[PDB]
Amino acid sequence: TRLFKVTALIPSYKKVRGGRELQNTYFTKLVEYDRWFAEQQRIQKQGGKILSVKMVAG
């Protein structure tokens, strides 16, 4: 179909990052439909939790 707007939180589990890394932890982004399966799988396998999924366009 078309774009999702997904909000996710990806915590850190393998180390403690000296950089600010807040923009890499909680973020909302637009994903194309054809990419969302892989992106959701990557978010899940990184231990991140998906706050919300919406369907912006389509």
Partner 1 sequence: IQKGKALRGAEGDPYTIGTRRSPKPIFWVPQGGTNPTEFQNVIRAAYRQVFERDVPDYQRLSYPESRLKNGEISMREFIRQLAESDLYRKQFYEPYPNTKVIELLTKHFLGRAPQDQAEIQRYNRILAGKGLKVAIEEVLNSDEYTQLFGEDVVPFKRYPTLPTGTYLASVATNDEMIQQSGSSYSPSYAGYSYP
Partner 2 sequence: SVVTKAIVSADAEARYLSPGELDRIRGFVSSGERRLRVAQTLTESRERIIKQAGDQLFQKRPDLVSPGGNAYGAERTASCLRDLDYYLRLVTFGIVAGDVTPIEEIGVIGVKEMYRNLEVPLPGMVEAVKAMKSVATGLLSGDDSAEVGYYFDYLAGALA
Partner 3 sequence: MQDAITSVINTYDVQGKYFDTSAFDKLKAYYATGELRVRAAGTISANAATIIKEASAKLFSNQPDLVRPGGNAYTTRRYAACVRDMDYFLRYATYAMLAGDTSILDERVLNGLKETYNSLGVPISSTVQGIQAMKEVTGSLVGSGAAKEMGVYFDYLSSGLS
Interface residues toward partner 3, by CB under 8 A: 9, 11-13, 16-18, 20, 22, 25-26, 49, 51
Looking at the Cβ atoms of 17 and 49, the one nearer to partner 2 is 17
Query: What is the Cα–Cα distance from 3 to 34, expressed in whole angstroms?
Result: 9
Among 14, 16, 37, 15, smallest CA distance to 53 is for: 37
What contacts 15, CB < 8 A, 6 or more positions away? none
Q: Map residues 11-40 to x or -, x wherever contact with partner 2 holds by CB under 8 A.
A: -------xxx--------------------
Name the one range near ligand CYC by CB under 6 A: 9-17, 28-36, 42-50: 9-17
